[PDB]
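Components:
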Amino acid sequence: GVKTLRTILSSVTHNGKQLVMTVGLLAVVVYLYTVVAFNFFRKFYNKSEDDDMMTCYLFHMYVGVRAGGGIGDEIEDPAGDEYELYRVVFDITFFFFVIVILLAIIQGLIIDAFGELRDQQEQVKEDMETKCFICGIGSDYFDTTPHGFETHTLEEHNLANYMFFLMYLINKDETEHTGQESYVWKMYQERCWDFFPAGDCFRKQYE
Amino acid sequence: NFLELAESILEYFRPYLGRIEIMGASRRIERIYFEISETNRAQWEMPQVKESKRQFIFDVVNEEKMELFVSFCEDTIFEMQIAAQISFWGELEVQRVKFLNYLSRNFYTLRFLALFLAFAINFILLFVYYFLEESTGYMEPALWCLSLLHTLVAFLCIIGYNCLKVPLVIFKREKELARKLEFDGLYITEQPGDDDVKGQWDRLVLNTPSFPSNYWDKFVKRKVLDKHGDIFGRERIAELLGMLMSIDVKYQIWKFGVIFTDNSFLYLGWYMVMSLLGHYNNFFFAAHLLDIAMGVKTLRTILSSVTHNGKQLVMTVGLLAVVVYLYTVVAFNFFRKFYNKSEDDDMMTCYLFHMYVGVRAGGGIGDEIEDPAGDEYELYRVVFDITFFFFVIVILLAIIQGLIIDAFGELRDQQEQVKEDMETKCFICGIGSDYFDTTPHGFETHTLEEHNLANYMFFLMYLINKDETEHTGQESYVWKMYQERCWDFFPAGDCFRKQYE
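Structure:
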């Protein structure tokens, strides 16, 4: 519906190939962690009052989704002696590394991409101002006059001025084409497009 | 007009020839013309050539340019030759050769397939002993067969691929060493510096029955020995290189060490060992295969962005640990009591607790501790908790985020920078500005016709073949300059158009 809204949406959705690949990576890392937990911290869970690899992976994923937090925290805490130090180490690593990094990347992608889009758009706006698009020499050079570059822009070249010209060329007959140097017409029908200038504006030309 | 009469022949000979480059050449800047071997041209096109070019460009962006370029073109020629080559004892040898040639193609396909096999094995594993564990009864046998097939494949593909990567890599090292000897002395110029490593290992190997093996040259090496000693007496020189049932030694040992050093080879080997484990006990094998597979460059790109300036990231995490222990000590000395609860520690125990509570799971250090209604001593306890909850965690998070995020943005900008600069200044060339522009797409012309980059590579390749007379026809002077080496001639400074006029 709304373009600005549309713009935000576009910024949000981009280089998400990418975003998707990262989410996939996250899933892979998580299953891997669950398998390791499964083989070294067996027990824990199976609790309330009084799993197979698949069940365990499912649990880790679900606990994680609802809702972030700490994988270690959800699991029953171990007072040891065990085997307790190893369990704690595992939990700390998981809580501080996958989640934090995942979040950071998601954020950067959402952010860096965003900044990038804005910069690129701004770039487009500025460049247009700097080099005459007609034209090819959008520098002040047009400047060593009173707003002389400004004049080239209004009088130019003409862009839209050219479009009117094309319509006029379309209508006028053979004689009209001859009057207009039709040569322009032959060039168009070439098509061939050379004539459009590029290189030199009148002012440079003289002199 | 005369030129105009002749057109069909010209177009054809046209994709065929390039033009050349211009060199200083005893003043002025003439531009030579040579007839480009087509086969080389066809070979040059392709995935690998393009990848190499992109890599060279990236390296240039990262930042002697002319020398680097020459090295790059060379290596490339060597690679092309190698690819072309790749394309009852005697029968056995022929068979081995055919297998090795396949193995190439065998290598990429294998890597792709290897990833697939690993993936399947891992999925299946995910699916007192292990029941193995529902589904069709045949699943256990299928799993064993898949593992046997995959491990063998990794074991076999890994060796062939590594082998090819290996002559390609060794050649470069040998060339570098040769270049160093000709114009400098390790211990001889002024003893190799006591630095890696590597350079030191090379210095040790340096004396071999055959040194210019795989490279192309040799007598040149003897000649180099001759140039010095030659103020070195014959003896130091002899002392250096001097000079089946029987095999060269030192060379083989050195080769093995060099192969061992490369990261890619180590990676492949590591993955294969993972296959032994993958047998041994299934979970380890599946995990190894999975870690090993990825794989995707874009994914690779994201991973690279993620891992960077993490020295850095690591130093910050270390700082966090230090701050936390410090806080725990302070809490230990002023808010004693609290904790030691459920129903009815030493500095070390306390630090451990803070760290664990913090890991599982973030939140508030103060929140985990029993809340104090006072009177106490309660205000002080609250102050301590607030400071800790709002300052270390928030700041730590912010820095981690910036570093990852800033780093990411930076990598992207830097890459883009590389892309733009290439567009703006002709790399040939050195004056990549519109100036080439005051013509109809005149800069564009310099780019297509140029200069030629690749045009120069083709030319160098041609120069390698033509003999002495051919060199004379070609001004050989270019050849002497190359053999100098000396590289001046490559221009830099002026393109034809500026030159006239």
